Structure formats: structure tokens, C-alpha cells
Amino acid sequence: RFRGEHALRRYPSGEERCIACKLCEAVCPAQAITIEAEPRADGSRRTTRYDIDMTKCIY
Amino acid sequence: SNLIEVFVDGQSVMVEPGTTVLQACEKVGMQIPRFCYHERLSVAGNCRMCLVEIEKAPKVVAACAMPVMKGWNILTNSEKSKKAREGVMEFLLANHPLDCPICDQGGECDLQDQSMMFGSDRSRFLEGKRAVEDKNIGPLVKTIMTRCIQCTRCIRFASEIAGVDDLGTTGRGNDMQVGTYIEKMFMSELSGNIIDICPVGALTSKPYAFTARPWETRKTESIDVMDAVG
Amino acid sequence: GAGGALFVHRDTPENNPDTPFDFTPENYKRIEAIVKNYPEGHKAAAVLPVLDLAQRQNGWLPISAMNKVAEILQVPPMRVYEVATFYTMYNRKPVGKYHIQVCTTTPCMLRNSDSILEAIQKKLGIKVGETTPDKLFTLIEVECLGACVNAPMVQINDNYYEDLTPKDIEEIIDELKAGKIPKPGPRSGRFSCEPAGGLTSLTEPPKGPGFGVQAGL
Amino acid sequence: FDNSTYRNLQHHEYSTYTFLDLNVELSKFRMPQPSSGRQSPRH
Amino acid sequence: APKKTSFGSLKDEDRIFTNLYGRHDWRLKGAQSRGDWYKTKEILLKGPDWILGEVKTSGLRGRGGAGFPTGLKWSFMNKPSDGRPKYLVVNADEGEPGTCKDREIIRHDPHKLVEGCLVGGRAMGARAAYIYIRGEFYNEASNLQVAIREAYEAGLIGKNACGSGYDFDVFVVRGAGAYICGEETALIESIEGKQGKPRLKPPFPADVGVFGCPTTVANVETVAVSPTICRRGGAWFASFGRERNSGTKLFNISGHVNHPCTVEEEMSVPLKELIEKHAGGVIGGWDNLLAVIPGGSSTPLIPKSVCETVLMDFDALVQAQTGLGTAAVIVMDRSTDIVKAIARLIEFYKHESCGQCTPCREGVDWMNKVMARFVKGDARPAEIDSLWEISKQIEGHTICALGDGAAWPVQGLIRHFRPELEERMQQFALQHQ
Ligand SMILES: NC(=O)C1=CN([C@@H]2O[C@H](COP(=O)(O)OP(=O)(O)OC[C@H]3O[C@@H](n4cnc5c(N)ncnc54)[C@H](O)[C@@H]3O)[C@@H](O)[C@H]2O)C=CC1
Ligand SMILES: Cc1cc2nc3c(=O)[nH]c(=O)nc-3n(C[C@H](O)[C@H](O)[C@H](O)COP(=O)(O)O)c2cc1C
Ligand code: SF4
Ligand code: SF4
Ligand code: SF4
Ligand code: SF4
Ligand code: FES
Ligand code: FES
Ligand SMILES: [Mg+2]
């Protein structure tokens, strides 16, 4: 359960898991996450910006 | 003059004849849950989310389509009204897809908010859900029909406000679907309003897709300059 | 269970807006008579009979027939599409020369309608959604036909064949595909909704006009 | 008098257009229809 | 000996539909031979108030299945005209499983229905009559058209019907395979060229009906008895049956009986007597009886323990928690899979829902899936209470009464055969680990 450095994960096929719902951005108590998104070239819902300020994060 | 007296939770209200139960309730600041009723569109009565209990009446009435009668005592927060709301919300959510994180309506959804405010907090639906195929009605309005709750708001707007009779329903019961039955773009100078009137993510803006969430946006009120209507 | 028929139309070489369809002059006169049965401000009321007439003349309903009806009655085509998809007696696909419909509802089901269904399936070699490769027989399951008393009952081309046993429907199919017209009704020497034997009522002769007319009239 | 035979045998000679032929025949016995004052609700 | 307490045997002279089995010519000549279209002019010249009074004092209740008092309903349409025409709409959809009475009425003596249309229109001050016949009843509709043509040529209807100086037309409209179109408002919508979707009440059809005009929807059996009631009077009809259950009735007995048939009998006849007299008794003896559906698929089923003394009227069957409905008897013996029959009925209702309102459109399909799983036995016993609650939610929350007709059969099944469902789930669990 230890909480360390952040990472973004993939499905077994290699496709990203993140779908730009921005729930993490909404809930973050330090406002450390910044997200931008748009439809990908194949129509998928994906991010174009996913930034975490680690000097703002309270982990 | 011709005003009659009705009671909303024991409070006397004087209203004009032909006033519906929903309007009498909002005369005192109580907003009844709704999905198919729009105040600028014809009354439909199909969703059944507006059902309320009238005192000394065994059957609940549809507040959106029932005219108030003299001496009536609406009970907007009784056990029967709450149970009717919970049952209707359960039926609405039974076949709804788990699409909220990928849905553009998320965060400003009437289905979500009214489930939070008037429905239950869990499911007892143990079957598989339905899935309908998508429709193409032009480059402006994105269509994801599986999310449709069959409100029929878009059909009424198209017929009455836009004057275009291209929208309707095909099939019956569970299989009933909203569309054009053929490949035909619903193109109108007012077509983009069906996105606003649709309470769910079934009809959404295609240029806006996936770009923002409602809690993020800052709202500025201004005037349109694209014509002289203002 | 599931329907099996889609309610979205996709254009096909055999079914497109430019598919040829037009009423015959006799059918145009019949349409005039149908329309003249309603108040002058409401001609959309004739949508159902005119659509049925188009089906009777053509056999089924291509999208061109729906557009033709909408143009004839000055109704938006979407309303005609709605009506055509809502009512199950409308064939939006071609069917066989004889449309065999068997009731599978509980009253019919209780009196062995599965025997009739399996007899038809074995005699024709098709299931409850398919069509004979000769393109003259089609088999489907319908709900309740309103003739529950005679069970199992099968309706073919708007005719009722009642009190069926597997042999009865088998010979009906044989003489239908032999170019003959089977006698509609029951096949148990009953020819009505009467009891199968005895005539437990209405045995005395019916009486005349003024049998029990009240006084002062 | 007798209850021997069945009297509904005629419907055996009914074709596809019999109903509409009867409607056409009866069209000359009706009364003038009322009018809503329009040609359609969209007029 | 006034106030009869034992009913169930009326002879032929007191029967209305004397040509029920079609043994006499149905052509106008047979109807006149049997007393049809007799002294209709004098009745028409008695005024609408007299006819409404006869129908009221006769205590006749709607034969469609709701048992609404016909006199009050027909007097609802007795207002002064305001410019709009007035119409009478005769219901002939007949979509209830187990029901075949209207078919026989239309095919075997349609002149009764035509004259009932005339007298009802006169009573209701209706300009014309629309008969909405089931589309599958092609031959019946053709016979009705032949009778209508004969009446038109004989001057019985049309311009100056009989000698009353009253103008009245009859029109026959055919549906296209939709059970929901039997509901009065859905029927009106289907007549006007729309989908057969019921509309909300109020307004009632007496104020805003077909074409937005005042109209009354009445079952064909209800309409076809009004002329004879006028001729023989309200009292003769009100003598049969119990109080508030007056008159006679057509009964359809189908299912597991030796000789299924349709007969005319006095109302309050006991179910056992009717079954063993007109239907030849239950197949394999009365001790082989499992359950009986008294009034069509929309009425809850009752076990054999109740069919020993129950009467066939509205009030007694309501006290038995099962309703009278359309008086369509479906008999199921001890060899019947009772879960399968109710599941098939729920599948029928799922295929017949119009989809308009949320509770029916979603919950009936949900109940269909649950019952399909119940038939095999995959579920758990808590799902029985879950299904009860689902049916409760659907009932009373829908636009029309089809939600009621879907919810009630499963409620009756759960009420009277819960051990069967429980033991079926037990068997499935022990078979599939
Ligand atoms: N004949 C058949 O094959 C079928 C019969 N049914 C039966 O239909 C029954 C339910 O029918 P509903 O019409 O929905 O019940 P309902 O009670 O709402 O209506 C019955 C009649 O009474 C009239 N009525 C009722 N209240 C009125 C009022 N306050 N003012 C004026 N008129 C009023 C209605 O206009 C209607 O014509 C069911 O119990 C079922 O048994 C159902 C399906 C098929
Ligand atoms: C789903 C549904 C289907 C119905 N189908 C019929 C029908 O086929 N024939 C009929 O006479 N009534 C049918 N009814 C009941 C009608 O409301 C009834 O005909 C109407 O109230 C006439 O009233 P009456 O019984 O006084 O004649 C149906 C009701 C419902 C809810
Ligand atoms: S936006 Fe955040 S919460 Fe949403 S899917 Fe991506 S990482 Fe998860
Ligand atoms: S429309 Fe449906 S999927 Fe989208 S946010 Fe609302 S409830 Fe969730
Ligand atoms: S698309 Fe939207 S407005 Fe139209 S029926 Fe569906 S939920 Fe209602
Ligand atoms: S209860 Fe069913 S049939 Fe009746 S209006 Fe609602 S969805 Fe349609
Ligand atoms: S808001 Fe009244 S039924 Fe939908
Ligand atoms: S159950 Fe077969 S006709 Fe009704
Ligand atoms: Mg929307």
C-alpha cells in the first residue's frame, strides 16, 4: 500500500488506460494535476497534457 | 378573480385555472424532478419522474400534465412520492451504460444529479444491458444513442421550435429508438439546441468533445454579435 | 425473445428511394375512397389503410412505398416510417407467397402448439425466421390471434386454420404448395367455437321479432 | 328449421381487395364529412 | 322468492347472442328473423335521455374488462354541442390471450353490433361510428362490411336512419398487429394515423378524443347488447346476476379442458359449474386441476382451492384478489409447468409494450429476464421478493394499464406458488454445484 512516485499505466495491449475524465484533477487537494484533452486521430478520448507538480503534491 | 386555492405541503397557494401541479409547486419554490417536461415544449408525460402524491388519493399523479384542483394538498416529500422517484430512477438506470468517465455530460448531467438527489445509492439489476447502434445526423451534433433515456425532447423541439419533422421513434417497447430511420443530417439554423435540451450525453457537441469538464470552466455573460438579434 | 429485425434502414440496390413503386389506378380509386372516410382537415388518419394497401399490391414495403404514401397524403416521411416500424403486420422485407404465422401464447401453447411448430419446421426444412428457398413459404411466431378456443391455430395469408394436429398442418402445406386453397377454419368437425360434441346450448329454435318486447314502446 | 349446417361459408370466397372494394361501394352512401377549417394542422 | 342467491342456468329465450355459433344466416334476413333491427325507429324517437336511463337502470357494466358502469359513461357525452362533431368508437381489437367473444359477435351476427352502434350514437348524440377491428380479423371485418352495406341499402343507417330523421354513418378501421391499440386512448391515436401510444388522462375522451372531438370508446359486446336492453328494458337485464353484477356474459373456456368452447351464461355462475357443464370438465377430472386464470392474462391466477366456490362476477373475483376482466377462462391442470406459463405471459407483455413510459418499457423487460431465469432456476430466493418489489414499482406508475397487466400475473404466481419457485431454485443449485 506504500505511496511513492506517480506513474501512468497501460492495458496489456499497450493502449493507455487514462481516458481524460479529470476525476484525479478534481479531487487533488493540492491542485497539483493539470490536464488537457481532445479526440485522438482515431477518435479515442485521450489527453494531450498530463502534468503533476511534485513540489505541490502531498502524496 | 377566478383564482383557486390549492395547498402544497399545507401552504395555501392561489393559482389560475389550468395550472399544473408542477407549476403550483414551483409557485412556492419547490422544483419537482423531471426528465421529459420542458417548459418551452409540449407536455409529454413519458418519463414518470414527476409523480407526486395528492392527499386522500390512492394513485400518484404526473405533476407535469395534471391540472391542480381546488382544495388539493400536494405532498412533494411524502413516502409515496419518494418511493415513486426511487423506482423510476431505478428503471432509468437499469439499462444506462457505465459511461460517466467518458461521457461529456459528466458533471452537468440531470440523470447523475437526480440519481444523487432522489434515487437509491445501489443497484439490484443483475442482467445484461441493451446497446443500440449510433446515428449520424451531421457534423455538429454527436450522437451516442445507448445513453438515450427516451425523453423525446429532441423530437418535440424539432417539430415545434425548428419546424423540422426529421426526428422520431422506430420500433416499440425496449427496442424503441430515437432517430431518422435513414441516413439524413438534421441540419437547421437552430439544430445545436438539441444538445442543450437533451438531459443526458446522448446528444453532445462534436466541436466540444473531450475538451473540458463543467467544474473547470469560468462563466462570462456577454452578448452575441453574429447578427442583429443580440 | 429478441426481435431479430432492425429498425434502421440502410440503402440497398433492392431497396432504395429510387426503387420503382406506384399505385395502380384501381388502387388510386381505393385510396380516394379511404381518404374520404375522415374529416377534411385530417388526412393523416388514412396512413394505416393506405400503407396496408401498398403492401397488399406490392407484397412488402420498400422505402419507396413509404415515401410514396407520405407524398400522397402530404405527411412528413418520418411519420410514415414511425407507423411502418411500430405495427408488426407491416413487412419491411420481402416474404414468401404464403406467410405462416403460428401462435405461441399460453392458451395456444397449453394445447401442444409446439407440435404444430415442429411439424411445419420438419415439413419445410426451415426455422421460425427463415424462408423456403423456393421463396413461397415463410414461418414466424406470433402472439395471440384471438382464436384461443381452437388450438393450436395457424394463420396463413389472412386466413385461419384451426383445431390443428400435425397431420392437418402437413396436408395444409401440401395442398397449398400444390396450388390449391385449403378450407379455412377448424379441422375437427366443429367449424366454430362450439363444444366439440353435444351443443350444450342454443339447441332450442331462436324466436321471432316481438318475443319479449316491453310495453309502452 | 334445423341446426344442421354452418352458415358462415361465404368468407371462403374473399380475395385480397374485398374489404377495400366494399369501402369503395359504400363511399356513395355516406354523408358529407365535417371540416376543421384547414387543409392540415400545418396549414 | 326474490333476490336469487344461486345463478348459473339460463335457457335460450333469455340469451342475447342467439347466433353465437353461426348456425343461421348472418345476412340481414337472419337478423330480422331473430328479431334484429325491430322497432328501432320507435326507440330512436324516444330520445337519448330514455336510452341513457334504460342503460343506467339495467346496471350494465363495461364488458371490455374494467366493469365501468355503462350508463354514467355514456351520459358523460350528453353535453350541448359546441361546434365539434361527436363520435362513437367501438373497440374490436381483442388482444387479450384467452379471449374470442368479440370475434364471434362480429362474424356471426354483426347486425346486432350495427344496431347497437346506431342506438349508442343516438344516445350519445354521435355523428358517426368508427369500428376499430383487429387487423388479423380480415374475414370478420369483411363480414362486418357486408352487413354494413346491407344496412345502408335497407335504409337502417345513413341519411335518415330508419324513419327517425337522424343521420348516422358507420366506418370500419383495421389495425396492424398491436395489442396496445385496444386501450381506448391508444386506439384513438391509432385511428388518427399515429403510433398506438396511449395518451394521459385527463383529458378524457368525452372532452378531447378522436380528432380532438368528444367521443366514447365502448367494447363491441357492450354496444351489441344495448338494442335488446332497450327493447326488453333495463329491468329484464338487471334481473340476472347479483346486485351491481347484473346481466349475462360471454365466457371463453380454453386450456386443459376436454371441450373448450365459448358460451353465454348468467353472470354469477360458479366457475366449477361452468367448467364442468359447458367445457366438459377439466382434463383428467376436477381433482387434476392446478390453477385457473379467470379473466385473461392480465388477471392473477387462483389455485384449485379457490375455484371450488368462487363466482364469476366483478365483486367476488375482486375479493378473491383476481379480478373478472374479460371473462376468459384459461385452465391449467397438474401436468402444467406453472412457471413456464407465467413466463410466457410476461414474454407476451414484453413484446406488446409500446415503449412510451419508463416503468413499462424498462421494468417489463426486466421482469421478463428475471422470469426466464426463474424457469430454469438460476436465481436465489431473495430474487422472489425483489421481483415482487419490481412489480409493485411498475404498477400504478405507468401511463396506461398494461403495466398493471404485466405486474399482476407475477404477483399472483408469487402469492400462490412460491414453494415451486423455491424448490426449482433448490434443484438447480444442487444440480449445478
Ligand atoms: N377486451 C380485451 O381483449 C382486453 C381487455 N382488457 C381489460 O381492460 C382493463 C383496464 O382497462 P382501462 O380502460 O385502462 O380501465 P379504466 O377504469 O381506466 O377505464 C375503463 C372505462 O371507464 C372510463 N372511465 C374511467 N374513469 C372515468 C372517469 N373518471 N371519467 C370518465 N370516464 C372514465 C374510461 O374512459 C374507460 O372507457 C383491464 O382490467 C383488462 O381486463 C385488457 C386487454 C384486453
Ligand atoms: C392494454 C389494454 C388493451 C385493451 N384491449 C382491449 C380490447 O382489445 N378490446 C376491448 O374492448 N377493450 C380493451 N381494453 C380496455 C378498454 O379500455 C375498453 O375497451 C374501454 O374502456 C371500453 O370501455 P367498456 O368496457 O365500458 O366498453 C384494453 C385495455 C388495455 C389497458
Ligand atoms: S483523468 Fe485522471 S482519473 Fe481520469 S482516467 Fe485519467 S488518470 Fe484516471
Ligand atoms: S449522461 Fe449517463 S453516462 Fe453521461 S454522465 Fe450522465 S449518467 Fe453518466
Ligand atoms: S436523444 Fe436526448 S432528448 Fe432525444 S430522446 Fe434521447 S435523451 Fe431525450
Ligand atoms: S404502460 Fe407500457 S404500453 Fe402503456 S403507455 Fe406505458 S410503455 Fe406504453
Ligand atoms: S416530467 Fe412529468 S412524466 Fe416526465
Ligand atoms: S393463445 Fe393462441 S390465439 Fe390466443
Ligand atoms: Mg446533452
Tab-separated table of C-alpha atoms in Angstrom, chain C residues 5-100:
chain	number	residue	atom	x	y	z
C	5	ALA	CA	-35.342	-7.256	-37.261
C	6	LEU	CA	-33.516	-3.928	-37.188
C	7	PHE	CA	-35.307	-0.580	-37.065
C	8	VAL	CA	-32.626	1.277	-39.037
C	9	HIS	CA	-32.847	1.368	-42.834
C	10	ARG	CA	-29.679	1.157	-44.928
C	11	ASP	CA	-29.941	1.686	-48.671
C	12	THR	CA	-29.680	-1.464	-50.791
C	13	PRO	CA	-29.830	-1.997	-54.570
C	14	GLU	CA	-33.057	-3.939	-53.977
C	15	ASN	CA	-34.427	-1.336	-51.529
C	16	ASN	CA	-33.570	2.323	-52.148
C	17	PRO	CA	-35.564	5.537	-52.712
C	18	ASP	CA	-35.318	5.002	-56.483
C	19	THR	CA	-36.829	1.520	-56.344
C	20	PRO	CA	-39.857	1.564	-58.690
C	21	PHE	CA	-43.219	1.672	-56.929
C	22	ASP	CA	-46.556	3.208	-57.880
C	23	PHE	CA	-50.208	2.530	-57.157
C	24	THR	CA	-52.388	1.133	-59.905
C	25	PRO	CA	-55.357	3.308	-60.966
C	26	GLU	CA	-57.750	0.948	-59.170
C	27	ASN	CA	-55.653	1.324	-56.028
C	28	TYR	CA	-55.748	5.104	-56.514
C	29	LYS	CA	-59.555	4.984	-56.559
C	30	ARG	CA	-59.472	2.820	-53.427
C	31	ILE	CA	-57.152	5.358	-51.780
C	32	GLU	CA	-59.609	8.126	-52.657
C	33	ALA	CA	-62.410	6.142	-51.018
C	34	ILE	CA	-60.233	5.511	-47.946
C	35	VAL	CA	-59.354	9.197	-47.599
C	36	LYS	CA	-62.983	10.296	-47.940
C	37	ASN	CA	-63.813	8.488	-44.649
C	38	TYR	CA	-62.339	11.177	-42.363
C	39	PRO	CA	-62.859	14.894	-41.683
C	40	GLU	CA	-61.375	17.150	-44.337
C	41	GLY	CA	-58.722	18.614	-42.044
C	42	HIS	CA	-57.332	15.202	-41.009
C	43	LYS	CA	-55.931	13.235	-43.947
C	44	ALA	CA	-53.078	11.748	-41.907
C	45	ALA	CA	-55.674	9.348	-40.480
C	46	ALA	CA	-55.513	7.403	-43.754
C	47	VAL	CA	-51.841	6.467	-43.246
C	48	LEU	CA	-52.553	2.973	-41.911
C	49	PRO	CA	-55.025	1.776	-44.620
C	50	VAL	CA	-53.033	3.297	-47.488
C	51	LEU	CA	-49.816	1.707	-46.226
C	52	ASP	CA	-51.644	-1.615	-45.922
C	53	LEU	CA	-52.945	-1.217	-49.486
C	54	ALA	CA	-49.424	-0.528	-50.743
C	55	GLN	CA	-48.303	-3.718	-49.010
C	56	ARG	CA	-51.197	-5.718	-50.494
C	57	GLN	CA	-50.355	-4.522	-54.014
C	58	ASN	CA	-46.579	-4.955	-53.651
C	59	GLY	CA	-46.248	-7.804	-51.148
C	60	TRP	CA	-43.965	-5.848	-48.830
C	61	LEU	CA	-42.986	-2.241	-48.092
C	62	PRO	CA	-39.831	-0.807	-49.669
C	63	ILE	CA	-38.700	2.637	-48.575
C	64	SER	CA	-40.010	3.955	-51.898
C	65	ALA	CA	-43.525	2.811	-50.964
C	66	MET	CA	-43.298	4.682	-47.657
C	67	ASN	CA	-42.098	7.824	-49.435
C	68	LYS	CA	-44.912	7.450	-51.979
C	69	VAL	CA	-47.542	7.203	-49.236
C	70	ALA	CA	-46.055	10.211	-47.437
C	71	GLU	CA	-46.184	12.227	-50.663
C	72	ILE	CA	-49.737	11.105	-51.480
C	73	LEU	CA	-51.066	12.095	-48.052
C	74	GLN	CA	-48.831	15.195	-47.670
C	75	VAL	CA	-47.443	13.754	-44.430
C	76	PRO	CA	-43.753	14.004	-43.442
C	77	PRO	CA	-41.959	10.754	-44.332
C	78	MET	CA	-40.746	10.285	-40.752
C	79	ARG	CA	-44.330	9.754	-39.581
C	80	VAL	CA	-44.833	7.028	-42.189
C	81	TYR	CA	-41.559	5.431	-41.084
C	82	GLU	CA	-42.790	5.543	-37.478
C	83	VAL	CA	-46.084	3.867	-38.373
C	84	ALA	CA	-44.385	1.242	-40.545
C	85	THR	CA	-41.950	0.314	-37.764
C	86	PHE	CA	-44.483	0.372	-34.914
C	87	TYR	CA	-47.017	-2.112	-36.312
C	88	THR	CA	-45.917	-5.720	-36.757
C	89	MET	CA	-48.213	-6.555	-39.683
C	90	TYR	CA	-46.007	-4.392	-41.929
C	91	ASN	CA	-43.308	-6.269	-43.856
C	92	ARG	CA	-40.255	-4.072	-44.393
C	93	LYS	CA	-38.587	-7.084	-46.065
C	94	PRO	CA	-39.827	-9.475	-48.764
C	95	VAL	CA	-41.710	-12.558	-47.595
C	96	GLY	CA	-42.933	-15.795	-49.119
C	97	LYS	CA	-46.065	-16.292	-51.173
C	98	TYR	CA	-47.689	-17.712	-48.023
C	99	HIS	CA	-46.859	-16.217	-44.616
C	100	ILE	CA	-47.312	-18.945	-41.997
